[PDB]
Every structure is written in structure tokens, then in C-alpha cells.
Amino acid sequence: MDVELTVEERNLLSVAYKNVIGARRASWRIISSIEQKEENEDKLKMIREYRQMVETELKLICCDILDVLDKHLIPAANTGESKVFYYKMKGDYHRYLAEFATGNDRKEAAENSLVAYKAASDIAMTELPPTHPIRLGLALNFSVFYYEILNSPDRACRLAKAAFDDAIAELDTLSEESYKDSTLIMQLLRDNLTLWT
Amino acid sequence: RAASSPD
Fold this sequence. Notes:
cadherin binding (chain A); identical protein binding (chain A)
């Protein structure tokens, strides 16, 4: 029940699946904006029928991806890089589940997201340099989880600033051909900080 | 409303 992916294979699969999931997420946000405006007989119904139609698909994907993470990918992870990668993916997809879940489900997902993120963190801080793109993307998505889901701008800004400063510290001792990657995630973290503040 | 990591 085990599968090992090269960095390229898992990167390409991640790009494909998150392209699909981002399409669905943006569609859901737009349908929600339409619902809110019309709410403020038959149209709204259909609108809801589309929103319920979106939410389902999204779920079916996210759930189906998390299964493959749990039943297959996460157990079969040797390198710490891949471990942090798969735990961040678990946290990200639980975050997407929480983004539209209602009731205690929104609670559920949220928990399973944090437990995932923390997990990756507990590896990253002891297995990956602060300059590593996996670790920086983990910190960025984790601070996003803090700000948008758990509604904690304080912890979010703390995590973002910590990651950015540790990166910018270890930056001087870093090859250019291995720092051009970290550049973009570091700048995204900086932009997110300037916005939140 | 806030940027996550590119994928």
C-alpha cells in the first residue's frame, strides 16, 4: 500500500491537482458572492443549487486526495523534504475543506489542518534550512491558515516574520542557483506581512 | 484575500 514519488513526479501531480482545486475554489467564492447579493425565489434557489453543486465536487476531490496522502504517500516518505511536503499538502487540503465547511465540520477540518501543519513544522525546523523552498512554502501556507481560518492575525504575522527573518539571515550563505527559488516565497511572505500589518 | 504558496 506504499508509493514513493520522485520530486518531479509529486511536483507535477501537485501542480495539476491544485490547478483544478483553485479553479473550483474561485468558482465557489464567486457563486457565494452572487448568493449574498441576491439574498440582500427561483433564481436564488438555482444559485444555491450551484453552490451545493460546487461544494460537493470540491469535497470529493479534497477527501479523495487526503486518502491518497494517508493510505499511500505519507507512510512511504523517507526524506525529510518529502515528509514536510506531504504534511503541508495534508494541511492545505484540510484548509480548503474548512474554507467552505459549515457546522462542526468546519471545526473538524480546521483541527486536522493544524495537526498536519504543526507536523510538517516539527520536521522542517529540524530537517530543512530556513532557506528551503519547502519550509518557506510551509510557513507561508501555515500563516495563511492562522490568519484566514483560525482568525489569528497575531500568530500569523509572528510565523511569517519569523520565517522571513530566519531566511534573510541564512541568505548570505546560499548559492544563487539555490536561492532564486526561495526568493519568490520570501517575497510573498513579505507582501502578506505588509498587508496584514 | 491573502496569498498562499504557488503550486
